[PDB]
Amino acid sequence: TPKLDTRAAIFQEDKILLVQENDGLWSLPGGWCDVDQSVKDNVVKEVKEEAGLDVEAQRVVAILDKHKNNPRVTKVFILCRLLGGEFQPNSETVASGFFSLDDLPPLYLGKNTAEQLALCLEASRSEHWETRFD
């Protein structure tokens, strides 16, 4: 079957949380779903490990086919609510920050486009949401 990728979208003052990798590109916390873990458990653990943050998985923004949306992977964008924490040294990422969608840092487009981040912001602002899929 297609490989599962999970991405967490965390907002504070409508600014999105992004993590920076060794190559200097920025992306939503996430990655390939651990075989023995569910989508929700996987995003929450990845946010803790990559951004030092405690979050609660809240809403499925979108389930998207990488080939149709990014430069065989099914990508699950999960809107998460911040509980707390702070960035800590780790083997996966080197920095994190809250970024305005009008002034984004260089993105790892294969992981998340500006369009997908804008979709996540719209999901965070909506009382009702229709999960997108293709």
Next chain:
Amino acid sequence: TPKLDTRAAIFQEDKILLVQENDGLWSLPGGWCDVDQSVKDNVVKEVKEEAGLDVEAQRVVAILDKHKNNPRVTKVFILCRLLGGEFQPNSETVASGFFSLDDLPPLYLGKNTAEQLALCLEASRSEHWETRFD
């Protein structure tokens, strides 16, 4: 990553479409997601192949972990809207029908519980829907 399973929920007069397998058990059309196909393309093709029906993928009912909900699989329940067609001979299923949730036939519980079918009915009746996940 976990294997992806897609299930299509099709309603007519609030009765759900179920397909019967060689073992005499009934389930929603679906199966493991083809590696080169998206979730949507995969459910639509599986409905055509298993039930002889043309449907349009509409809504993500739920993305559920098999281990937490059924007797390492991530299950995607998709609400589909019927376009037309009729049951035809095939190598996967032997019959199909619309069943009332108050009088269901014997189910392949590993594929779909009565609870998951009831969840799909609730999604078909709701103008707004919050996609469930765990």
